[PDB]
Symmetry: C3
Subunit: 107 residues, 3 copies
């Protein structure tokens, strides 16, 4: 989907993870976070629509999303092993990566 | 997945959106609608299994699904910005596209 | 995502299906099962990371996952038609395929 709809989805799902109780609520929201990244991995932010697809500034955005999909995958495995608290702790660091990525291309 | 299982998923998720209360319930169901389209974008309806992959009748089905995935993406962004009512209003028009697509290839 | 995080997701979602009440809870968990398979269809289990990508042992793992994604698709259509009980019955046989696949590459 659109880039900022996925980024707004990621931010809202982090608010569902922090207020979650069991590991099922955390695991499902983390998979919705993975879902939004897969639908928007092909997307392009609004301020980068007039940049070369091989431009390093656009190429910087591509690997930055790989890091985001990678960190989300890590938190899913922690939430899969039943570690509901340590996965929420991984969601704290995940929000740092999400917020830093969203601000760099929000415009 | 199978074409009509996704189309039945889309129809049921629309029934979850109309009876939803907050923006989280609408956003999650809209992502399930996006999920079903991604799993079945490669699929083929039963009545079109004996049509050429480059046939305009089959090619008409392909772009018709792009329109569906496009409208779903629009409603996700409206539900991402917090506009829970205007996104439900986008789900009303979404059901028109879903119903018209499903009837054309239901058989 | 990682192979065993998806396999742990599949196992937990089966526990959500057996204790589910309506067809919406079964259909959503079955789509999360389809979600985990799509994110990890490209993945590789830990004990098979040093095997040729064209090796029959690794190639056996690939088709084994196709069977899993195929059976999940079948149960989704049964849960899409409203058959909440017959889809739960398909989840019983689904757990057999999941457990047999996970044990063969758990290590
Ligand atoms: Ni995909």
């Amino acid at each position: 989907a659109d880039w900022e709809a996925a980024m707004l989805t990621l931010l809202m799902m982090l608010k569902v993870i922090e207020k979650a109780d069991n590991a099922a609520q955390v695991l499902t929201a983390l998979w919705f976070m993975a879902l939004a990244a897969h639908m928007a991995a092909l997307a392009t932010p609004p301020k980068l629509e007039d940049k070369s697809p091989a431009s390093p500034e656009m190429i910087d955005f591509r690997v930055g999303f790989e890091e985001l999909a990678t960190e989300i995958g890590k938190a899913i495995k922690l939430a899969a092993l039943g570690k509901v608290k340590e996965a929420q702790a991984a969601a704290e660091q995940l929000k740092t990566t999400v917020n830093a990525h969203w601000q760099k291309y929000r415009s």
